[PDB]
Design a protein around this ligand. Structure first.
Ligand SMILES: CN1C(=O)c2ccccc2NC(=O)/C1=C/c1ccccc1
Ligand SMILES: CN1C(=O)c2ccccc2NC(=O)/C1=C/c1ccccc1
Ligand SMILES: [Br-]
Ligand SMILES: [Br-]
Ligand SMILES: [Br-]
Ligand SMILES: [Br-]
Ligand code: NI
Ligand code: NI
Lengths: 287, 287
């Protein structure tokens, strides 16, 4: 059976329950084609200048991504569409509050544009977070997902051009002896569609077989505010931060965070006061 | 049997193994009396002006600490002794690298001075982190400690003035039906001595019974860089940050972090590069 397909607006309340059951769901029209176009246009040059993932120039090289792959993260200062439209997505926030209510506040662990070159091979079948957060491997098998990944198509996803593989139900697997490409189904998607998986869903980028098509995706890893993001917004100019909504500011770590603990004492606080109150951080100040 | 006592220098290699076994150890002369004096002098006025933990002025009130208790965190900008001597402690870093090698890099989840007033009651027997990090309750019972707490005496700890209670072995308890003050032993300490416990050690602040003595402690919660600190250093002036060692900068979250994953892709990175490389962050620049 195939990855369940849900409408971003009509089926909103069904999205997280579907992922909790099956470990995957396709959100049709997660982003409008307008947002997809502006995002592609804004990140285009940064993709072109990005060195290889394991460049000797980098002090945090990525030795896992294929050398032909390009990843651009810290999108807030690059993309108006990302920092305004994506970070304030009603669909994303409903899904995240549904997913993470047991833990408390959530934020962006990483928002990255990934461009896969022609003839890019399939990734090995994997769970995310194993190269950054060893702690998640020590969680009880029954523990609610501490992170989820929105794999948004910025170009068409086909079986030919290397659409994502997922094993439905694999987010509940403890025994991994039945892990095989034979057990996978494909995430066929138009630009603006999003494949939503958990940190436990076994999946992989597909093989590019046309030899001509460049595939591009926006991967948004949303995680509980108790987990450290893969990316930092510390160097993002304060003027850009002060142009955002308070919600967007929290997602970039430019605000204090709260746990779901009845008498929560909070995260990233300053002597009982928030970052935003302390620093007198303004919001929605146009550039 | 009593809390094991170890010399900060002669017994350095024994400190973490002792805590892993017994859930507690007293580090004799963790800080020199010189450092204790300078720390007390530098934080003195900030303790006096600090409102009640649950002050209506605060947007992150602490509803758990007794109203007479005073907690001052984000000590880097207050205290030269803290930011230079404590953050670069050879003993602290050996213990933390011993404790957290399985996870990777560690940093300060919170460094706070706590002053307990005369007639302060004993805290309820508890494990730390339950009002900030619900995630730790979902870790497997056998999981290595993801945070440890250095309870440094800034004044004498006596049975009379409310010295810490610990239950030895309680860090390995799953069944909590034998939890009682009857099962506790006391951390009797001179200023500069430190009681080291894990996030699973069952313990409590003791009752102040003299009715005259003010008790003061420096609580340093050290945790894996994968967990979000209780406190933020985002508002600490860049000049103060650039006066620190690179190690101290990492502990305050003003640097990228690494996991122990063989092909680690890192935490708080910027397109494959560190915070410190990206922002051209200087170190050991005297004010
Ligand atoms: C290494 N790696 C990434 O870089 C990555 C990239 C974008 C978003 C999340 C992310 N995290 C991962 O766990 C990851 C998995 C992965 C596994 C196998 C093959 C290629 C990737
Ligand atoms: C609430 N609370 C704190 O505020 C606190 C203070 C300093 C350092 C860590 C810390 N974290 C806690 O878990 C904590 C425990 C706690 C429990 C029972 C009674 C009083 C405290
Ligand atoms: Br790849
Ligand atoms: Br993919
Ligand atoms: Br208290
Ligand atoms: Br105490
Ligand atoms: Ni993946
Ligand atoms: Ni405690």
């Amino acid at each position: 059976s195939q990855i369940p397909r849900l409408s971003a607006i009509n089926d909103l309340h069904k999205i997280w329950p579907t992922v909790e059951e099956h470990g995957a769901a396709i959100i049709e029209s997660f982003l409008s084609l307008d947002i997809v176009r502006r995002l592609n246009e804004e990140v285009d040059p940064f993709v072109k200048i990005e060195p290889i993932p394991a460049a000797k120039t980098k002090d945090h090289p990525n030795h896992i991504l294929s050398t032909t792959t390009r990843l651009v993260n810290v999108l807030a200062p690059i993309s108006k569409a990302y920092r305004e439209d994506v970070l304030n997505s009603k669909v994303l926030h409903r899904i995240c509050s549904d997913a993470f209510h047991v833990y408390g506040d959530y934020w962006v662990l990483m928002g990255a544009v990934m461009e896969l070159a022609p003839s890019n091979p399939a990734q090995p079948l994997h769970r995310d977070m194993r190269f950054s957060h060893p702690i998640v491997e020590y969680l009880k098998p029954d523990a609610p997902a501490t992170s989820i990944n929105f794999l948004v198509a910025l170009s068409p996803f086909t079986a030919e051009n290397g659409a994502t593989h997922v094993i439905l139900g694999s987010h509940k697997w403890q025994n991994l002896s039945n892990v095989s490409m034979d057990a996978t189904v494909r995430a066929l998607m138009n630009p603006g569609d999003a494949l939503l998986i958990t940190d436990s869903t076994i999946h992989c980028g597909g093989a590019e077989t046309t030899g001509t098509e460049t595939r591009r995706l926006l991967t948004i890893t949303m995680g509980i505010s108790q987990l450290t993001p893969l990316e930092s917004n510390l160097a993002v100019p304060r003027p850009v931060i002060e142009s955002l909504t308070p919600l967007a500011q929290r997602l970039l770590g430019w605000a204090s965070q709260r746990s779901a603990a009845p008498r929560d004492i909070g995260l990233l606080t300053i002597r009982g006061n928030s970052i935003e109150k302390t620093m007198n951080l303004k919001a929605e100040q146009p550039l």
